[PDB]
Design a binder for this molecule. Structure first.
Ligand SMILES: *[C@@H]1O[C@H](CO)[C@@H](O)[C@H](O)[C@H]1NC(C)=O
Ligand SMILES: *[C@@H]1O[C@H](CO)[C@@H](O)[C@H](O)[C@H]1NC(C)=O
Ligand SMILES: *[C@@H]1O[C@H](CO)[C@@H](O)[C@H](O)[C@H]1NC(C)=O
Ligand SMILES: *[C@@H]1O[C@H](CO)[C@@H](O)[C@H](O)[C@H]1NC(C)=O
Ligand SMILES: *[C@@H]1O[C@H](CO)[C@@H](O)[C@H](O)[C@H]1NC(C)=O
Ligand SMILES: *[C@@H]1O[C@H](CO)[C@@H](O)[C@H](O)[C@H]1NC(C)=O
Ligand SMILES: *[C@@H]1O[C@H](CO)[C@@H](O)[C@H](O)[C@H]1NC(C)=O
Ligand SMILES: *[C@@H]1O[C@H](CO)[C@@H](O)[C@H](O)[C@H]1NC(C)=O
Ligand SMILES: *[C@@H]1O[C@H](CO)[C@@H](O)[C@H](O)[C@H]1NC(C)=O
Ligand SMILES: *[C@@H]1O[C@H](CO)[C@@H](O)[C@H](O)[C@H]1NC(C)=O
Ligand SMILES: *[C@@H]1O[C@H](CO)[C@@H](O)[C@H](O)[C@H]1NC(C)=O
Ligand SMILES: *[C@@H]1O[C@H](CO)[C@@H](O)[C@H](O)[C@H]1NC(C)=O
Ligand SMILES: *[C@@H]1O[C@H](CO)[C@@H](O)[C@H](O)[C@H]1NC(C)=O
Ligand SMILES: *[C@@H]1O[C@H](CO)[C@@H](O)[C@H](O)[C@H]1NC(C)=O
Ligand SMILES: *[C@@H]1O[C@H](CO)[C@@H](O)[C@H](O)[C@H]1NC(C)=O
Ligand SMILES: *[C@@H]1O[C@H](CO)[C@@H](O)[C@H](O)[C@H]1NC(C)=O
Lengths: 785, 780
């Protein structure tokens, strides 16, 4: 038959012609199972490769190359063919400690197409070091040469498949995926490898689930139906829209059927090499509404003169229905190209080149020396040639970097069923040359598969769970921003007393608002205080121009002159209120204004007392009146009140501090008013409390004798001025209790100026009136009346 | 010593053997292991003792000799494949044929006692299955070796990982921990255990928060992932070295204590058990095997070593060249190893299967053709073999069944000991009363996830397999828009939402309604004030020619009473729904009449002050002009300036009816608000100056005892106005925003009542009750 061709050096093969998709005493042969077409395709590829070696006189001249292909089941039959290959021509395999002198029947073996059988065959062959170039086996366990010394490969491992998947996800900006594996070892290792790889590229896995192993052509149980319903419900409820599947193609019919039944659409499925080229699933022709079906598969290399050769055409070494099965799938195989066929082609060519180099042939003659399998392995480890514009050389880890290819399923039989969209180069670990992909969206937009929306400019990122890439966006509170260069996970406030608005990434400096010389209310208050100051200066000039008069002598001469000078000083330091509040400014203000005002009010009160209530008190305590008249009662009272005010103002300075303060007004954080007392309400309340305690007794004493002429109607004018001061203080207290803002300083200054104006006018202006316009009442002879 | 010479023994049926006797390419040469291992020699001697005991017995294998070929296989499979090929070779020949199927073979060994290593057992079983050679392997544990599809002739004497993992899952479910983290070693043992436990947890409802692989001697990321989830029960299905590295790193980083469910690999290993500082790593709960022990094995080992020391027997009579040059002290540490019983029972199982296959009684065994190895398999399943008084059975999948003990570590003087606190014979039965946990008190460490979310909550999937949900409550003002939402959505900022609500409720208005108790009381006060104004007006218009009203104004007094009544009337328009016109016209309507009455009172005060504290020369001209048409022009000017100020502040300062949607908790607001202290202050300034002038000109005066004090009433009216409004302002700035209009009307009504009871009421008292003081010489 075609499974055997005698030659100088045989070349064993292992191709899965049949698979199981529906008692140990009866051994089920591979013939009873359903016929697979890929196995016969690869077998014909190997036959064509050997036949081309035979044609080529430049490669292996005068050395006929043969082969012995044995049908190997998927799992069931994997030991007998190895024993056949290693047995001698008599089917006897000797046992010895060392096998260097041993000459096997075959010189090399093309390994099985599934990883488990490859592992078993390589485990058996490790004793004799028979070169075994497996194809289409993608397990990472074959990458190490400690336990597989004589195992080579012509297909990139699952490492490069996973890398291509991750690069495809990165290119389209997907960071929230779903992994579905199978109960078999292949799915589990692929899922674990993808999970290990994807964690370092800022891509998270929403959830991983295992699809129960379920061959087709058999009815499903209730437990597996419930399991599939649960899987599909979990898939639909999650927000991820990129589903990678690591499962053999046989177990995916029921899952996709359940997905169609559940009416779930909008998933960008990513396929491993197992079912990315499976023709039956594409022929199902109802998945076109699910979404785009990407997949990872080996790049197709067009072999010249292979389609015509393929179309031209012991135990477990026969098949009958292979040709009939391949007849139906001929067109799709021709259109889709050859992907795994080139792997077998290259493996056979590598064996041929290793034999040619080992024999040392000079393209004319060959030495025809006996070749041991270990010598062939040592030679094939160091082959480096070309084949269809592809370099064939083996890495130290037993792999040749064949270009991968991301393929997208296209539901149109007029062209290739699996249209290539991208190419991956394992040598540089780079995925490049990406073409347009027909997406399933409304207007061909790349589907979005991100768990968390991008945060708005100036929004703190708060982790929501275990997954790093998922977060929630919460606005930073007023007064802070985000320094994206430093960290975006926590707001960083702006120092230097500057405030920020909501969702604002640039702190702005607060403007320092304060009393300034060129404004309207300050100019009005300055004009009022100037009018008062010139009025009081004129009063003082008049008083010094008119002395030795009953008006100024019955009244306290030194007392009134001192009060006038203190009012002059207070008016002259009034503009110290305006301007930049410094330590000296507040020191002078609080050591001058309250002192002067308090001593003026104390003088007024003691004068009212001595003019009204002294006469009445003269009746009860006579010796007290003698003490009062012998000394200078009003002067000692004024001194005592002055020292008490000194004590209280010193305690106020020691309590509330001296440094000018910055208070953030509720109207506009952007502004910051500066007063000099950090605690101003309590200080003003204390000052007004002492002043009003003195004022109530002063005004009561003035009222008690308001009709007595005394010192030219002193009680009446004291009463008028003191009631004016009381009303002004009440107005200030109420306005303070019902307002707090920028106008506090100007209102306080206005009230102080008005109080000084009251004390000046309503107590001295009558005196100026009588002195100037009434020159008859100031004569000494009028003292009698 | 020549101990290795005893590794063979001729007999009618000879058993194979693959033991780890020794320990650790270009040419195809089998590697040679020269290092010596005590465990392998102990197991080989156990098998030899079992074979000798079977030969000794007369009721088992009667008149038949059972042999053994104990071959040394290292942990590597390359060195182990050669003994297997020797086993499958024809007896007396060194060549193994490559036949079509198993039936044509004539193997030299009846059965094989499989390798201890399960990774080696994989290759050995897959090789033997083609020839259907019955191999029973001690120590091979992981589950996929039980698959009859690829291992039709692989049995074992130790339980699979499936039963112990089922026991662990049942323990976690029974103790309530359905939110656990699963870890495993990077070798095949850990991966298979992780897959099996994943299946069992999915079946039992348990949730795996993080499934990860601790690398063999990275770990930091695994610990970080475990700590990220709030998990207090961690199943570590790892080998000894991986567990030791894990616990050493956890000691270095001071990881918080957790309940470590231990696999049998490191549950009883002294390396992990004796780690310094390990006591602070929570409780360790494992499932140790419950198997009998050979009570005479050490005696046999000592006696056989001594008998081998004698040269007479040794001369009277390689696989382990290093096994000859040993002493007793080189093996004394491993006599009490529980795999010796497994080897013993495996040999007994093969012997009993052979006895059943030959079908013979205790007296003898009939002669027949030699039995092929593949004929044992028909009787090795369904096989009941008694080993040391305890019966064992081979399941349909070659699995033996035995009980388990839940052992937990305790700590006293850094001495960890194992106590049985449970038993697993297919159904877990724990005694948790005696269990001492690691927490502050003796309480079970809780580790539970919410399988379902309570109604009205948002659900966030959590776990490596989306097993449970995290219920999160969000603060008021938010609602769950749809059940599948991952975050509750806000509603329209004009509607309120209660805490933990499926939907929001609309915000309805709440202003000062006509039915509120405060408005009712203020309405009664307004009624009383208006009645007083009407009575005073009636008295002032009936006794209009009397000296009382003539001195106290005249037409002007009645005009002021009308104005006070109109102020009381304008009080009415504050409450109710804030129409823009009403809220705009609140204040001007309040001050327009009050301005008129205050100006009339000020005219009276000015007349009194002019007649009192001025020279007669100016008085004779001021008094005759301040009463009459000039007084009317003065009151008209006051009203006109009030009108001008009111219209200017109405066109410039906007009184707005704003709807503060975010003031009341469950309701909106309709606040009629104007400029802060600017609008009403400016409208109030004219009245303030008018009242202050009246008070200043009236409050001090000479009241002769023979006349009438016409200043007391005006002084007290101004005082009532001032004190009531000075008290009103803080109430304006302090009372709740709803009752602000009520405060305003209360202030206006109190001002009117004070003015009345101070000025008009004392006049009316003597105008109505005691008309004996109405003489012109007393008033004018
Ligand atoms: C060359 O190979 C072809 C098929 O590739 C085969 O049919 C033919 O016999 C070979 N020899 C020659 C001389 O063409
Ligand atoms: C089971 O298999 C039979 C035979 O192929 C098939 O007819 C049937 O639909 C399947 N399902 C059930 C539920 O019987
Ligand atoms: C869509 O979904 C519904 C609801 O699950 C399902 O019954 C139906 O078969 C699906 N397909 C169509 C075409 O309606
Ligand atoms: C191709 O797809 C069709 C349409 O569903 C299907 O019937 C057929 O079995 C598939 N396979 C072929 C023609 O080989
Ligand atoms: C292929 O099928 C046809 C009928 O369609 C049959 O005549 C022929 O023998 C088959 N060929 C095989 C089984 O090789
Ligand atoms: C194989 O040969 C090519 C062509 O000279 C060279 O570029 C390449 O580096 C070689 N590869 C190795 C592995 O030596
Ligand atoms: C796709 O095309 C239509 C027609 O030009 C355009 O109006 C529409 O916005 C596009 N779709 C999307 C989702 O942007
Ligand atoms: C923000 O980060 C930059 C870059 O490190 C640094 O220079 C700067 O001081 C930080 N703060 C602000 C307020 O920009
Ligand atoms: C077998 O029996 C003999 C006596 O017949 C005894 O000496 C020997 O120890 C026994 N073997 C054992 C117990 O392994
Ligand atoms: C084994 O193969 C031979 C080949 O001659 C066959 O006759 C025999 O029936 C086979 N035995 C089985 C399948 O059990
Ligand atoms: C335990 O961990 C520490 C910290 O990493 C390390 O230094 C030490 O060598 C480790 N111990 C062992 C026995 O490996
Ligand atoms: C573990 O997580 C807790 C809780 O977030 C944290 O405080 C602690 O630093 C983490 N690390 C360790 C080693 O405990
Ligand atoms: C016996 O033990 C000694 C002491 O540990 C050791 O040196 C010697 O190698 C051992 N003999 C062996 C392993 O054969
Ligand atoms: C049991 O079998 C033996 C061997 O054939 C035979 O000699 C004997 O008679 C049988 N019966 C009894 C009761 O031992
Ligand atoms: C043997 O196994 C079969 C399986 O069908 C069972 O019916 C029978 O009871 C078993 N015999 C035993 C356990 O002795
Ligand atoms: C397991 O043991 C319990 C008692 O601990 C017993 O009730 C139960 O029947 C046993 N189960 C089996 C399968 O033997």
């Amino acid at each position: 038959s075609d499974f055997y061709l005698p030659g100088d050096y045989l070349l064993g093969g292992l191709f899965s012609l049949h698979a199981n998709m529906k008692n140990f005493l009866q051994v089920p042969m591979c013939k009873e199972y359903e016929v697979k077409v890929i196995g016969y395709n690869l077998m014909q590829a190997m036959r064509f490769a050997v036949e081309e070696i035979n044609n080529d006189s430049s490669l292996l001249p005068g050395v006929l190359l043969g082969y012995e292909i044995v049908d190997v089941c998927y799992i069931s039959n994997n030991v007998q063919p190895v024993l056949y290959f290693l047995a001698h021509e008599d089917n006897l395999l000797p046992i010895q400690e060392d096998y260097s002198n041993y000459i096997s029947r075959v010189v090399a073996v093309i390994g099985p197409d599934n990883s488990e059988s490859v592992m078993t065959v390589a485990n058996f062959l490790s004793l004799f070091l028979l070169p075994q170039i497996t194809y289409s086996a993608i397990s990472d366990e074959l990458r190490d040469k400690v336990r597989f010394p004589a195992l080579l490969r012509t297909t990139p491992s699952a490492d490069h498949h996973i890398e291509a998947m991750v690069q495809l996800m990165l290119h389209f900006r997907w960071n929230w995926i779903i992994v579905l594996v199978s109960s078999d070892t292949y799915g589990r290792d692929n899922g674990q490898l993808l999970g290990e790889r994807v964690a370092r590229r800022d891509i998270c896995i929403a959830f991983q689930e295992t699809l129960p192993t379920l061959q087709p052509n058999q009815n499903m149980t209730s437990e597996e139906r419930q399991r599939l319903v649960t899987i599909v419900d979990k898939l639909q409820q999650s927000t991820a829209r990129v589903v990678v599947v690591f499962s053999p193609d046989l177990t995916l019919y029921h899952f996709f059927n359940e997905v169609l039944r559940q009416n779930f659409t909008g998933a960008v499925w990513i396929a491993s090499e197992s079912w990315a080229i499976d023709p039956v699933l594409h022929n199902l022709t109802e998945l076109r509404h699910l979404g785009t079906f990407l997949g990872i598969t080996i790049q197709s290399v067009p072999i010249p003169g292979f389609s015509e050769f393929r179309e031209w055409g012991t135990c477990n070494q026969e098949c009958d229905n292979c040709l009939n099965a391949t007849l139906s799938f001929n067109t799709i195989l021709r259109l889709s190209g050859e992907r795994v066929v080139y792997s077998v082609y290259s493996a056979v060519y590598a064996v041929a080149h290793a034999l040619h180099s080992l024999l040392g042939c000079d393209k004319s003659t060959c030495t025809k020396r006996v070749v041991y399998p270990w010598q062939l392995l040592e030679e094939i480890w160091k082959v480096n040639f070309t084949l269809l514009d592809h370099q064939i050389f083996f890495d130290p880890q037993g792999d040749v970097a064949l270009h991968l290819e991301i393929v997208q399923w296209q539901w149109d039989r007029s062209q290739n069923p699996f249209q290539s969209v991208a190419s991956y180069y394992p040598l540089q670990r780079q995925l490049k040359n990406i073409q347009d992909i027909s997406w399933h969206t409304i207007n061909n937009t790349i589907p979005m598969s991100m768990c968390s929306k991008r945060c708005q400019s100036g929004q703190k990122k708060k982790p929501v769970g275990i997954h790093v890439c998922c977060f929630e966006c919460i606005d930073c509170l007023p007064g802070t921003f985000l320094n994206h260069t430093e960290d975006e996970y926590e707001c960083q406030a702006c120092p230097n007393n500057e405030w920020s608005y909501q969702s604002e990434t640039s702190c702005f400096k607060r403007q320092l608002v304060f009393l300034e010389w060129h404004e309207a209310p300050t100019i009005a208050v300055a004009l009022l205080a100037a009018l008062g100051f010139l009025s009081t200066l004129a009063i003082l000039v008049i008083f010094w121009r008119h002395f030795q008069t009953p008006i100024v002598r019955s009244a306290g001469g030194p007392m009134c002159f001192l009060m006038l000078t203190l009012l002059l000083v207070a008016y002259m330091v009034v503009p110290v209120y305006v301007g930049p509040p410094k330590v000296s400014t507040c020191l002078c203000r609080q050591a001058l204004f309250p002192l002067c005002f308090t001593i003026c009010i104390s003088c007024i009160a003691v004068r009212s007392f001595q003019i009204v209530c002294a006469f009445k008190m003269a009746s009860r305590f006579p010796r007290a009146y003698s003490y009062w008249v012998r000394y200078q009662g009003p002067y000692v009272s004024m001194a005592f009140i002055t020292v008490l005010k000194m004590v209280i103002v010193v305690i106020g300075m020691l309590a509330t501090g001296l440094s000018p303060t910055t208070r953030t007004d509720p109207d506009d954080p952007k502004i910051t008013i500066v007063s000099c007392n950090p605690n101003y309400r309590n200080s003003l309340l204390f000052n007004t409390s002492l002043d009003l305690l003195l004022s109530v007794v002063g005004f009561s004493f003035a009222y008690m004798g308001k009709e007595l002429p005394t010192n030219y109607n002193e009680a009446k004018f004291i009463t008028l001025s003191m009631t004016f001061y009381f009303t002004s203080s009440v107005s200030l207290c109420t306005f303070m209790s019902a307002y707090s803002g920028v106008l506090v300083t100007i209102v306080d200054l206005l009230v102080t100026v008005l109080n000084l104006l009251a004390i000046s006018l309503g107590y001295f202006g009558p005196k100026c009136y009588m002195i100037l316009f009434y020159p008859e009442r100031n004569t000494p002879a009028y003292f009698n009346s | 010593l020549c101990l290795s010479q005893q590794l063979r023994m001729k007999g009618d049926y000879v058993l194979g053997g693959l033991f780890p006797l020794g320990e650790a390419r270009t040419r195809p040469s089998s590697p040679v292991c020269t290092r010596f291992s005590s465990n392998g020699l102990l197991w080989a001697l156990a098998m030899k003792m079992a074979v000798e005991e079977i030969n000794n017995k007369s009721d088992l294998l009667p008149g038949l000799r059972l042999g053994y070929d104990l071959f040394d296989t290292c942990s590597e499979p390359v060195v182990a494949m050669k003994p297997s090929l020797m086993f499958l070779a024809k007896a007396g020949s060194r060549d193994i044929a490559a036949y079509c199927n198993y039936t044509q073979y004539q193997p030299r060994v009846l059965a094989v006692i499989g390798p201890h290593s399960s990774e080696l057992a994989m290759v050995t079983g897959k090789f033997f299955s083609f020839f259907l050679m019955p191999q029973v392997s001690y120590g091979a544990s992981m589950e996929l070796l039980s698959a009859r599809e690829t291992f039709p002739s692989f049995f074992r004497t130790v339980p699979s990982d499936r039963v112990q993992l089922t026991a662990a899952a049942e323990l976690l479910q029974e103790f309530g921990w359905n939110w656990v983290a699963a870890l495993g070693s990077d070798d095949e043992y850990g991966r298979q255990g992780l897959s099996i436990f994943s299946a069992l947890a999915a079946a039992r409802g348990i949730c795996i928060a993080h499934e990860g692989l601790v690398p063999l001697p990275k770990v930091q990321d695994v610990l970080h992932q475990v700590n990220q989830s709030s998990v207090q029960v961690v199943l570590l299905f790892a080998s000894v070295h991986a567990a030791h590295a894990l616990f050493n790193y956890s000691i270095s980083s001071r990881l918080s204590p957790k309940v470590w469910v231990a696999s049998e690999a490191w549950l009883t290993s002294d390396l992990v058990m004796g780690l310094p500082g390990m006591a602070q790593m929570g409780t360790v709960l494992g499932f140790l095997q419950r198997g009998a022990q050979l009570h005479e094995f050490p005696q046999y080992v000592k006696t056989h070593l001594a008998l081998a020391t004698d040269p007479a027997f040794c001369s009277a009579l390689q696989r382990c060249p290093q096994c000859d040059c040993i002493t007793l002290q080189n093996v004394s540490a491993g006599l009490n190893h529980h795999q010796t019983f497994s080897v013993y029972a495996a040999v007994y199982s093969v012997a009993q299967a052979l006895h059943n296959t030959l079908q013979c009684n205790a007296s003898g065994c009939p002669a027949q053709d030699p039995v092929k190895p593949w004929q044992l398999l028909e009787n090795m399943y369904n096989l009941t073999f008694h080993v040391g008084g305890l019966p064992l059975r081979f399941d349909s999948s070659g699995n033996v069944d035995m009980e388990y003990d839940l052992k937990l570590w305790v700590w006293q003087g850094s001495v960890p000991r194992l106590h049985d606190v449970g038993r697993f014979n297919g159904s877990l039965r724990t005694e948790r009363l005696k269990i001492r946990w690691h927490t502050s008190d003796n309480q079970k460490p809780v580790s539970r996830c919410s399988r379902q979310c309570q109604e009205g909550q948002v659900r966030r999937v959590k776990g490596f397999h989306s097993c449970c949900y995290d219920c999160v409550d969000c603060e008021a003002g938010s609602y769950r828009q749809n059940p599948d939402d991952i975050a509750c959505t806000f509603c329209g900022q004009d509607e309120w939402s209660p805490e933990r609500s499926t939907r929001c409720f609309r915000r309805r208005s709440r202003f000062l309604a006509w039915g509120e108790p405060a408005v009712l009381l203020l309405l009664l006060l307004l009624s009383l004030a208006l009645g007083l104004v009407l009575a005073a007006l009636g008295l002032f218009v009936h006794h209009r020619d009397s000296p009382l009203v003539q001195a106290s104004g005249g037409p002007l007094a009645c005009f002021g009473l009308v104005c006070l009544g109109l102020v009381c009337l304008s009080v009415l328009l504050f409450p109710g729904q804030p129409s823009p016109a009403r809220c705009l016209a609140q204040q001007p309507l309040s001050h327009l009449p009050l301005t008129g009455c205050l100006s009339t009172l000020f005219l009276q005060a000015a007349e009194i002050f002019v007649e009192s504290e001025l020279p007669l020369s100016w008085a004779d001209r001021l008094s005759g002009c301040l009463r009459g048409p000039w007084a009317w022009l003065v009151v008209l000017l006051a009203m006109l300036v009030e009108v001008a100020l009111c219209t200017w502040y109405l066109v410039a300062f906007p009184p707005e009816v704003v709807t503060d949607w975010h003031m009341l908790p469950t309701e909106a607001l309709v606040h009629c608000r104007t400029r802060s202290w600017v609008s009403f202050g400016l409208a109030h300034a004219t009245n303030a100056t008018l009242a202050f002038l009246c008070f200043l000109g009236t409050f001090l005066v000479r009241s002769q005892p023979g006349r009438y004090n016409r200043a007391r009433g005006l002084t007290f009216a101004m005082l009532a106005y001032f004190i009531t409004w000075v008290s009103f302002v803080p109430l304006l700035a302090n009372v709740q925003v709803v009752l602000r209009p009520a405060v305003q009307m209360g202030a206006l009504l109190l001002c009117v009542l004070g003015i009345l009871a101070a000025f008009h009421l004392p006049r009316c008292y003597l105008l109505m009750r005691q008309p004996g003081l109405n003489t012109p010489e007393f008033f004018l």
